[PDB]
Amino acid sequence: SHMSLTPDQIVAALQERGWQAEIVTEFSLLNEMVDVDPQGILKCVDGRGSDNTQFCGPKMPGGIYAIAHNRGVTTLEGLKQITKEVASKGHVPSVHGDHSSDMLGCGFFKLWVTGRFDDMGYPRPQFDADQGAKAVENAGGVIEMHHGSHAEKVVYINLVENKTLEPDEDDQRFIVDGWAAGKFGLDVPKFLIAAAATVEMLGGPKKAKIVIP
């Protein structure tokens, strides 16, 4: 699908939402960015450390839940199809939880399952966090589990195709691979605004750096 928003438009929309936002170049982050590895899990934007051992995969809110959420897919069967679709498209599908809250450890899914997106026009999932994880695992996905408290300092919205930024548990940041929404045919403006709202509702930092190629 089309990314449709220009970097300046993304910065402007976020500023209108009360965010501090700026554009940074792929060049400025040359040493930090990494090419996407097909063996890496498509995982959450969560900036915490975890038990992940499958690195360099794309980052989307809630892992593959970002895809179901944007598409309005709310059944376990639909979740299973998305799990298989992601796997068939060059990434190992994943969703995650944490040690303190188990499967409600994913902030994005907690917001979704409890209706925090109702007013933005999203249908609610017809399953709970445990059921979703079981379905993703059954369909061949990975269930990642984080540890520690959220300490993200900034949000990177990466528009550089087939590259990503990795978590740093001691110098955390939310990483949103906007280009991946395009890859999966998502409505990109809805996806980006949902990502911004997610950070807002979870009390994350309303500070963004849009990475351009």
CSV table of C-alpha atoms in Angstrom, one decimal:
chain,number,residue,atom,x,y,z
A,1,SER,CA,0.0,0.0,0.0
A,2,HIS,CA,1.0,3.6,-0.4
A,3,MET,CA,2.9,5.3,2.5
A,4,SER,CA,0.9,8.5,1.4
A,5,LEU,CA,2.3,10.7,4.2
A,6,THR,CA,5.5,12.7,3.5
A,7,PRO,CA,8.1,12.9,6.3
A,8,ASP,CA,7.1,16.6,6.8
A,9,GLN,CA,3.5,15.6,7.0
A,10,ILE,CA,4.2,13.0,9.7
A,11,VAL,CA,6.2,15.6,11.7
A,12,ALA,CA,3.4,18.1,11.4
A,13,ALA,CA,0.7,15.7,12.5
A,14,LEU,CA,2.6,14.7,15.5
A,15,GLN,CA,3.3,18.4,16.4
A,16,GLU,CA,-0.4,19.0,16.1
A,17,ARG,CA,-0.8,16.2,18.7
A,18,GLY,CA,1.5,18.0,21.1
A,19,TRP,CA,4.7,16.0,20.2
A,20,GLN,CA,8.2,17.3,19.7
A,21,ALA,CA,9.1,15.8,16.3
A,22,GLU,CA,12.0,16.1,13.8
A,23,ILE,CA,13.4,14.4,10.8
A,24,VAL,CA,16.8,12.5,10.9
A,25,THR,CA,18.7,10.9,8.0
A,26,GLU,CA,19.5,7.2,7.5
A,27,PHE,CA,23.0,8.6,7.3
A,28,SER,CA,22.9,10.0,10.8
A,29,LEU,CA,22.1,6.5,12.0
A,30,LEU,CA,24.3,4.5,9.7
A,31,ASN,CA,26.0,2.6,12.5
A,32,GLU,CA,22.7,1.9,14.3
A,33,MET,CA,20.5,0.7,11.5
A,34,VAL,CA,20.6,-2.9,10.3
A,35,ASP,CA,19.3,-4.7,7.3
A,36,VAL,CA,16.3,-6.8,8.0
A,37,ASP,CA,17.1,-10.4,8.6
A,38,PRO,CA,14.4,-12.9,7.4
A,39,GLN,CA,15.2,-15.0,10.4
A,40,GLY,CA,14.4,-12.2,12.8
A,41,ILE,CA,11.0,-11.9,14.5
A,42,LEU,CA,8.6,-9.1,13.5
A,43,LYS,CA,8.1,-7.9,17.0
A,44,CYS,CA,6.8,-5.0,19.1
A,45,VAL,CA,8.0,-1.5,19.2
A,46,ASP,CA,8.6,-2.1,22.9
A,47,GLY,CA,12.0,-0.8,23.9
A,48,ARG,CA,12.7,-3.2,26.8
A,49,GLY,CA,15.1,-6.1,26.9
A,50,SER,CA,13.6,-9.6,26.4
A,51,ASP,CA,14.4,-13.2,25.7
A,52,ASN,CA,14.5,-12.6,22.0
A,53,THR,CA,17.3,-14.4,20.1
A,54,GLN,CA,15.9,-13.8,16.6
A,55,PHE,CA,17.2,-10.3,15.8
A,56,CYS,CA,17.0,-7.6,13.1
A,57,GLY,CA,13.3,-8.1,12.3
A,58,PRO,CA,10.7,-5.3,11.7
A,59,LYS,CA,9.1,-3.5,14.6
A,60,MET,CA,5.3,-2.8,14.7
A,61,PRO,CA,2.9,-2.1,17.7
A,62,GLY,CA,2.1,-5.4,19.3
A,63,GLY,CA,4.2,-7.4,16.8
A,64,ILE,CA,1.8,-8.9,14.3
A,65,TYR,CA,-1.1,-7.5,16.3
A,66,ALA,CA,-0.4,-4.2,14.5
A,67,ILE,CA,-1.5,-5.9,11.2
A,68,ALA,CA,-4.7,-7.4,12.6
A,69,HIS,CA,-5.6,-4.2,14.3
A,70,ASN,CA,-5.1,-2.0,11.2
A,71,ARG,CA,-7.1,-4.5,9.1
A,72,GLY,CA,-9.9,-4.9,11.7
A,73,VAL,CA,-9.2,-8.6,11.9
A,74,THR,CA,-10.6,-9.7,15.3
A,75,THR,CA,-10.9,-13.5,15.3
A,76,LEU,CA,-8.3,-16.1,16.3
A,77,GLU,CA,-8.7,-17.7,12.9
A,78,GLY,CA,-7.9,-14.3,11.3
A,79,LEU,CA,-4.9,-14.0,13.7
A,80,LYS,CA,-3.7,-17.4,12.6
A,81,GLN,CA,-3.9,-16.5,8.9
A,82,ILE,CA,-1.9,-13.3,9.5
A,83,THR,CA,0.7,-15.3,11.5
A,84,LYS,CA,1.2,-17.6,8.4
A,85,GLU,CA,1.1,-14.6,6.0
A,86,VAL,CA,3.9,-12.9,7.8
A,87,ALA,CA,6.0,-16.0,7.8
A,88,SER,CA,5.4,-16.4,4.1
A,89,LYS,CA,6.6,-12.8,3.6
A,90,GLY,CA,10.2,-12.9,4.9
A,91,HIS,CA,9.8,-12.6,8.7
A,92,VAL,CA,9.2,-14.8,11.7
A,93,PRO,CA,5.9,-13.7,13.3
A,94,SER,CA,5.7,-12.9,17.0
A,95,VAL,CA,3.6,-11.3,19.7
A,96,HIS,CA,4.8,-10.9,23.3
A,97,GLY,CA,4.1,-10.5,27.0
A,98,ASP,CA,6.4,-9.9,30.0
A,99,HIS,CA,7.2,-11.4,33.3
A,100,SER,CA,5.3,-8.9,35.5
A,101,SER,CA,2.0,-9.1,33.6
A,102,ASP,CA,2.2,-12.2,31.5
A,103,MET,CA,0.3,-11.6,28.2
A,104,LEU,CA,-1.0,-8.3,29.3
A,105,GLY,CA,2.6,-7.3,29.3
A,106,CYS,CA,2.2,-6.0,25.7
A,107,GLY,CA,1.0,-2.4,26.1
A,108,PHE,CA,-0.5,-2.2,22.6
A,109,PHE,CA,-2.7,-5.3,23.0
A,110,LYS,CA,-3.8,-4.3,26.5
A,111,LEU,CA,-5.0,-1.0,25.0
A,112,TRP,CA,-6.7,-2.9,22.2
A,113,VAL,CA,-8.4,-5.6,24.2
A,114,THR,CA,-9.7,-3.2,26.8
A,115,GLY,CA,-11.2,-0.9,24.1
A,116,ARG,CA,-8.9,2.1,24.2
A,117,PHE,CA,-9.1,2.2,20.3
A,118,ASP,CA,-13.0,2.0,20.2
A,119,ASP,CA,-13.2,5.7,19.7
A,120,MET,CA,-10.7,5.7,16.8
A,121,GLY,CA,-12.9,3.3,14.8
A,122,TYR,CA,-11.3,0.0,15.6
A,123,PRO,CA,-13.3,-3.2,16.3
A,124,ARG,CA,-12.3,-5.0,19.5
A,125,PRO,CA,-10.5,-8.4,19.5
A,126,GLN,CA,-12.8,-11.4,20.0
A,127,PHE,CA,-10.2,-13.1,22.1
A,128,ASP,CA,-8.0,-12.4,25.2
A,129,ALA,CA,-4.2,-12.1,25.5
A,130,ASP,CA,-3.7,-15.7,26.4
A,131,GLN,CA,-5.9,-17.0,23.6
A,132,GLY,CA,-4.1,-14.8,21.1
A,133,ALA,CA,-0.7,-16.0,22.2
A,134,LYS,CA,-1.8,-19.7,22.0
A,135,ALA,CA,-3.1,-19.1,18.5
A,136,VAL,CA,0.0,-17.4,17.3
A,137,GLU,CA,2.2,-20.1,18.7
A,138,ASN,CA,0.1,-22.8,17.3
A,139,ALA,CA,0.3,-21.2,13.8
A,140,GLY,CA,4.1,-21.3,14.1
A,141,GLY,CA,4.9,-17.9,15.6
A,142,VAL,CA,7.2,-16.9,18.4
A,143,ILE,CA,6.0,-15.7,21.8
A,144,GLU,CA,8.6,-13.2,23.1
A,145,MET,CA,8.7,-12.2,26.8
A,146,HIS,CA,10.2,-8.9,28.0
A,147,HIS,CA,11.6,-8.0,31.5
A,148,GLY,CA,12.0,-4.8,33.4
A,149,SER,CA,10.2,-1.5,33.3
A,150,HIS,CA,9.5,0.7,30.3
A,151,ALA,CA,12.1,3.5,30.0
A,152,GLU,CA,11.8,4.6,26.4
A,153,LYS,CA,13.1,8.1,25.8
A,154,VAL,CA,12.1,8.7,22.3
A,155,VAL,CA,10.2,7.2,19.4
A,156,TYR,CA,11.9,6.5,16.0
A,157,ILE,CA,9.5,6.3,13.1
A,158,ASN,CA,11.7,4.5,10.5
A,159,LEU,CA,10.8,5.0,6.8
A,160,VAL,CA,13.9,3.3,5.5
A,161,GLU,CA,12.8,0.1,3.6
A,162,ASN,CA,14.1,-3.3,4.8
A,163,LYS,CA,16.1,-1.9,7.6
A,164,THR,CA,15.4,-1.5,11.3
A,165,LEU,CA,16.8,-0.3,14.7
A,166,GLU,CA,17.3,-2.7,17.6
A,167,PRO,CA,16.3,-2.4,21.3
A,168,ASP,CA,18.8,-1.1,23.8
A,169,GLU,CA,17.6,-2.1,27.3
A,170,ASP,CA,19.8,0.5,29.0
A,171,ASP,CA,19.1,3.4,26.5
A,172,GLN,CA,15.6,2.6,25.4
A,173,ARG,CA,13.5,3.9,22.6
A,174,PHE,CA,10.3,2.9,20.8
A,175,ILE,CA,11.0,1.8,17.2
A,176,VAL,CA,8.2,1.9,14.7
A,177,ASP,CA,9.1,0.5,11.2
A,178,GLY,CA,6.6,2.6,9.2
A,179,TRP,CA,7.8,1.1,5.9
A,180,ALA,CA,6.6,-2.3,7.1
A,181,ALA,CA,3.0,-1.1,7.3
A,182,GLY,CA,3.4,-0.3,3.6
A,183,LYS,CA,4.8,-3.7,2.9
A,184,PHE,CA,1.8,-5.3,4.5
A,185,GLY,CA,-0.7,-3.2,2.6
A,186,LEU,CA,-1.9,-1.4,5.7
A,187,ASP,CA,-3.6,2.0,5.7
A,188,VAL,CA,-0.4,3.8,6.6
A,189,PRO,CA,-1.8,7.0,8.0
A,190,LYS,CA,-4.1,5.1,10.3
A,191,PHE,CA,-1.2,2.9,11.3
A,192,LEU,CA,1.1,5.8,12.1
A,193,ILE,CA,-1.5,7.7,14.0
A,194,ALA,CA,-2.4,4.5,16.0
A,195,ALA,CA,1.3,4.1,16.8
A,196,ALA,CA,1.4,7.7,18.1
A,197,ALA,CA,-1.8,7.3,20.1
A,198,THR,CA,-0.4,4.0,21.5
A,199,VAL,CA,2.7,5.8,22.9
A,200,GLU,CA,0.5,8.6,24.2
A,201,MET,CA,-1.9,6.3,26.1
A,202,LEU,CA,0.9,4.2,27.6
A,203,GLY,CA,2.5,7.4,28.9
A,204,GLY,CA,5.5,7.1,26.6
A,205,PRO,CA,7.6,10.1,25.5
A,206,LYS,CA,5.8,12.3,22.9
A,207,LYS,CA,9.2,12.8,21.2
A,208,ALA,CA,9.7,11.5,17.7
A,209,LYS,CA,12.5,11.2,15.1
A,210,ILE,CA,11.4,10.3,11.6
A,211,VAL,CA,14.2,8.5,9.8
A,212,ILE,CA,14.3,9.1,6.1
A,213,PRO,CA,16.2,7.3,3.3
